[PDB]
């Protein structure tokens, strides 16, 4: 009371409480420990700026920790943003002959330092995403093409794969799952109920009747979906998103299935499949053609759209 | 009265040890651990019974609790149900320094705290239990 | 403008660190007799958890932060950045062990 006497920021009511003794260590425990520091060579995403969302490699980490020099893909029009593309020195000279040079392979154009077609520019710590980074094959190939060896580095990429595989797995009641770790390893079972997103009650299937009448709550981190041949499954995510069909071949991690829309075999990883007995695909907000549109096929051909798909159409002449 | 409860708890201790040995042998023979899950409801019902806590501490059932909590040599953790039931039972009973000395559950508790495959909620409860057990030693 | 001394944990203005040095770490760091680079390497302006201590001897918080043998003032729970290898080796020459306050070491 004496310490708070004479202060105006303290509220009118004596909103004081006794801190528990166990909480004493927690009140002074540190934060942001997950990441000792930013590691050079890692791939990160940019929060804002003209390169908002472009993946960037951390070439250098500044000792201050507020900024860091990064390797980026340039976005210029050379004289609303242009698409990312490797720095073309010849086109830059043609559109702007005021290029400066300082070393071999290190090019300075328009006040920006480009090393062998890649921009090297310092960016602040508050402008970067260092977690939940989603990499693309195109940007990966574009970054590792200059090292004369395609995607030679695969540790961080494998870690990104592990993270995407772990997060993309969503469960539903009745799904057949298999156990990877624990004492119940290599056991089959059906999901009975789902509580929150980390505890899943599973009823196991076995030759003993007394075991089949028991429900076991199992963490989602030790469950792998079981896909049987001849089941309707709908793709969760990927290039073949929202494609449905019947499973034909189960090559472990990779599953092959005959599609319903394209009616052709498609090979997608098992992590991208959900057992959906019906397609019910809506084609709205796609293409340029509503259903039953009278579309000009070519110079002297016309027809009417009969069925519509994500990347194809059926036309009756 | 109390002697009958002690005899029943000792019989439960022998059954728990036998089930643990059978499950370990089956795991070494390529079969899942099922006996512990089968015995889990009776152990849970006995542990939830409050008046048997004194008899449990007298018969040192916490040693077999530690044995169930002890990971098998194949580096495979026990089922989440067993860990949750045993942690809830540990919370529900007043474990003292003498009982911890008799059972040696602190080693397994430190292992659970340091391990990463263990659920973070179980990690936090283990930290809380370790703090509570270190509390009487320093005052 | 304020910076947090990495070694002892005290927080003082950067110009105070340059002109007068750290009142506690001056026996082993010589921050006042050091250039701006060494001051930056031992005092960081990026910190968190401002701490004001009145009585070092009896405060459990001071013992928990290992600042009960230092001058009362502004202290930081966590300081961004660590001491350089040469400064760490120099401190090990004096026989004093450096425990990082970055939180990453525990």
């Amino acid at each position: 009371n004496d310490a708070l006497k004479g202060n105006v920021n303290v509220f009118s009511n004596n909103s004081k409480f006794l801190v528990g003794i166990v909480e004493y260590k927690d009140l002074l425990r540190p934060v942001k420990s997950s990441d000792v520091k930013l590691t050079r060579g890692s791939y990160v995403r940019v929060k804002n700026g003209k390169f908002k969302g472009d993946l960037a490699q951390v070439d250098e980490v500044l000792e201050n920790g507020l900024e860091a020099r990064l390797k980026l893909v340039p976005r210029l029009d050379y004289g609303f943003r242009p698409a990312q593309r490797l720095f073309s020195e010849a086109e830059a000279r043609v559109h702007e002959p005021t290029i400066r040079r300082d070393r071999d392979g290190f090019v300075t154009y328009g006040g920006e330092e480009y090393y062998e077609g890649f921009l090297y520019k310092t960016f602040r710590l508050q402008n970067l995403i260092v977690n939940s980074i989603n990499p693309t094959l195109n940007e990966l190939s574009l970054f590792q093409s200059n090292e004369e060896s395609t995607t030679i580095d695969l540790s961080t990429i494998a870690d990104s794969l592990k993270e995407t595989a772990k997060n993309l797995v969503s469960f539903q009641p009745g799904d057949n799952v298999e156990i990877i770790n624990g004492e119940l390893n290599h056991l089959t079972g059906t999901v009975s109920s789902v509580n929150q997103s980390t505890i899943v009650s599973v009823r196991l299937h076995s030759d003993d009747d007394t075991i089949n009448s028991e429900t076991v709550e199992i963490p989602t981190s030790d469950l792998r979906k079981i896909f049987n041949v001849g089941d309707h499954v709908r793709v969760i995510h990927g290039k073949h998103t929202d494609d449905t069909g019947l499973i034909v071949e189960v090559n472990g991690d990779k599953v092959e299935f005959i599609s319903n829309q394209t009616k052709r075999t498609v090979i997608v990883f098992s992590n991208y499949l959900i057992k959906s007995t019906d397609s019910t695909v809506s084609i709205n907000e796609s293409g340029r053609f509503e259903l039953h549109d009278l579309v000009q096929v070519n110079s002297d051909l016309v027809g009417i759209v009969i069925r519509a798909q994500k990347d194809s159409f059926d036309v009756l002449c | 009265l109390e002697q009958m409860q002690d005899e029943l708890i000792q019989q439960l201790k022998l059954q728990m040890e036998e089930s643990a040995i059978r499950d370990a042998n089956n795991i070494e023979q390529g079969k899942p651990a099922i006996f512990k899950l089968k015995l889990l409801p009776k152990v849970k019902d006995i542990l939830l019974r409050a008046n048997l806590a004194d008899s449990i501490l007298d018969n040192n059932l916490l040693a077999s609790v530690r044995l169930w909590l002890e990971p098998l040599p194949d580096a495979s953790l026990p089922a989440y149900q067993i860990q949750k039931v045993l942690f809830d039972a540990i919370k529900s009973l007043p474990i003292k320094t003498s009982h911890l000395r008799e059972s040696g559950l602190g080693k397994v508790m430190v292992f659970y705290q340091k391990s990463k495959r263990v659920e973070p909620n179980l990690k936090r409860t283990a930290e809380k239990l370790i703090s509570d057990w270190t509390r009487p030693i320093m005052g | 403008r304020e910076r947090a001394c990495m070694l002892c944990g005290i927080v003082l203005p950067g110009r105070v660190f340059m002109q007068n040095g750290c009142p506690n770490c001056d026996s082993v760091l010589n921050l006042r007799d050091s250039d701006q680079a060494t001051v930056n390497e031992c005092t960081s302006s990026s910190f968190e958890g401002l701490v004001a201590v009145g009585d070092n001897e009896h405060s459990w918080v001071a013992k928990w932060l290992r600042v009960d043998r230092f001058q009362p003032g502004l202290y930081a729970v966590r300081v961004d950045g660590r001491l350089p290898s040469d400064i760490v080796a120099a401190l090990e020459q004096y026989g004093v062990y450096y425990r990082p306050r970055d939180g990453s070491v525990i």
Binding site: V19, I21, Y24 | - | S59
Partner: peptide, 13 residues
């Protein structure tokens, strides 16, 4: 040390 510095009953509130 660090582990020994955990609070006690007689420490200030």
């Amino acid at each position: 040390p660090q582990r020994l510095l955990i609070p006690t009953v007689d420490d200030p509130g």
